[PDB]
Design a protein around this ligand. Sequence first.
Ligand SMILES: Cc1cn([C@H]2C[C@H](O)[C@@H](COP(=O)(O)OP(=O)(O)OP(=O)(O)O)O2)c(=O)[nH]c1=O
Lengths: 733, 4, 13
Amino acid sequence: LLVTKRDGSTERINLDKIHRVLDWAAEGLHNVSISQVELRSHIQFYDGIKTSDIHETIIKAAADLISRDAPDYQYLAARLAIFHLRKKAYGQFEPPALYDHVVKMVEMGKYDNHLLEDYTEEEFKQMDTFIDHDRDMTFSYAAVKQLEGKYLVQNRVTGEIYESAQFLYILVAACLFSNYPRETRLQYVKRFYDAVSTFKISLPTPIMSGVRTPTRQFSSCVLIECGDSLDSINATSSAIVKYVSQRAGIGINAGRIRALGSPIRGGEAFHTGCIPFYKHFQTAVKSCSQGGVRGGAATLFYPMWHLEVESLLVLKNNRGVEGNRVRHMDYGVQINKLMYTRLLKGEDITLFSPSDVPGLYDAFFADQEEFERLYTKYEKDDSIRKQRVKAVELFSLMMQERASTGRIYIQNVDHCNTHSPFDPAIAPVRQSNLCLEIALPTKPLNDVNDENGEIALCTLSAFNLGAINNLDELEELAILAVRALDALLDYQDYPIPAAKRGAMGRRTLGIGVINFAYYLAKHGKRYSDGSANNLTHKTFEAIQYYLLKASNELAKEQGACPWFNETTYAKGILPIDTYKKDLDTIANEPLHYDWEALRESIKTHGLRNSTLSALMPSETSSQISNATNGIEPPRGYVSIKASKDGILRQVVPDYEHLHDAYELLWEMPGNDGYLQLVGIMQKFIDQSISANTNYDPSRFPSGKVPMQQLLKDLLTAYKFGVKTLYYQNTRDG
Amino acid sequence: YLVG
Amino acid sequence: SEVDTDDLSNFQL
Ligand SMILES: Cc1cn([C@H]2C[C@H](O)[C@@H](COP(=O)(O)OP(=O)(O)OP(=O)(O)O)O2)c(=O)[nH]c1=O
């Protein structure tokens, strides 16, 4: 009795239609009860009930029963939501024909017109045959919510949703491979499509939500290195404002800015401090947020020997004068072998202003021998202004602040340049990005449009380790992944000249993995005992091998990147030749691939891309594919997330058979197991990893994490060649 | 190949 | 915040 439709015209309720819909959705699921759902939603029905509401109600009801004991509610809820969205976009369950759709969308100005220019009507007709609209039924409720929330093309004001998952995927493919010769184009299109729609390859949000639409902005994070000059500060700041406006995460290197008290122009003026400028970089970053809060994240880097280091370290400590506080930015302290050595011998650390010690800053990253040489020399030189601190106090203060906030990050510069793809003398890595996984070379700007500056970019993607059956499937995946990302660099726009320079010069990529924990659980391994060490060595060998292979093949076809000659790769040096030698004591897995045959091929034909792998965290991307986040172990068997439409629940993949194989985050006794796996991964990764450190106060006497243990874990990490250190989770149930 |  | 240098000293970077 009495329902109202979308035109707002009354029809009577037919309660068996609803039933059928539910009945259909439940197909193949175990432990879901249609009755249960009917009961909980029928009671909320009323005369004059809009149809849309009817769907919302059953969806929610189904969704509210998601649990560890009945995980298939995830799919029952999802399908019902897929169905609803189908009707919401097309007016019927059946999606229109690709061509008609594109045409309409192009006319409405939601899709790029170039699509109709690049592909013929017949071509679209061919693509349509690839599409399998039934793949939409494999999504999990949490995934569908992400899709509906930030991927699908819609009108945010009105709430109209214009497309469905499969069209997204096929058109993303079409755009990325649109310049390919007609004799291969569509073969790639299909292959890519299959890879991404069956969750083998995962793509970042910017790409998924934008590629196929009129926009050209697709980079998520940027790296800017700032010079020690008002001209360069200004330029830097300008760049940041440009990039944060396009929702990009920023990574700033402000280590060269001189110290407070330092002489300016002669003796005519004395420097004011770095603080004042850091505050100015903060305002730049938050320039396009609501008030000065929402969005725009940045991570600032500085050497640990900077003269102002003690004032920089406590920039987040809430308890202090506003004047000496830059609270809304994360910081990365740069450390090298010498610094740790001073700590172990219990000696002192000498702090200097970059300006007063010629050649020290450069040596710090590029040559440890020379760094040491100059560092000692300047220590004695009495003319140099300097200040001594106990190694132990400095380290303690940093760890303290790291522990308190969890946002004081570490970057081992020496490791970053001794075991990298680049030659430190020509292009050293001197900073990282927001989430500490990118390591690329940068050169400071002297103006926003300065053509000789360099700004690195994050071009990302990831392999789903839960979706491949054997490591030899990576060969194909690598081919698609490297090829679509390489084409994207030539497709997207570059606001600042310096960002285009690096992008075209070196064509750098950052491909990592998702579902690592689940993958280990399937193989019956755990993080903390070292049982996964040899499997992880074997897995990451394959990944890096096939990525390098794919880039090399592309190089033959389209030519190596212009600045390929600055890489170590160009001099016949591979990741297996420069890794930290202590790794040999924690893993004996042998190399299964022909690295020598590849060594030659790279030397001869070069690489299309200078960097290929990087292990980034991934919240959104993992949800769509119902997977565990990046390499991290899951916090619990059910994840909870709040939304306007209700509480979102997502159950770990294959809980039903693997609940006992999983090792949850706080089940680990310590950080050793994880830290070793991280180090083993770094042997083959071209760039860096977003490694975390986790501590549970309940396992310590009096609920207080010992300083002895924080330094212990810090040194361990360095010993196994870890390049960077991200969050520090300190559990508080 | 390798640029030239 | 208690730190022992000796226990670290023997560590091999
Ligand atoms: C001019 C000026 C610079 N600075 C800082 C900003 C930069 O860190 C640094 C240099 O910026 P600039 O003085 O703009 O650059 P410079 O190349 O002229 O350096 P110098 O005077 O030694 O030849 O000094 C101040 O703190 N206050 C000032 O009044």
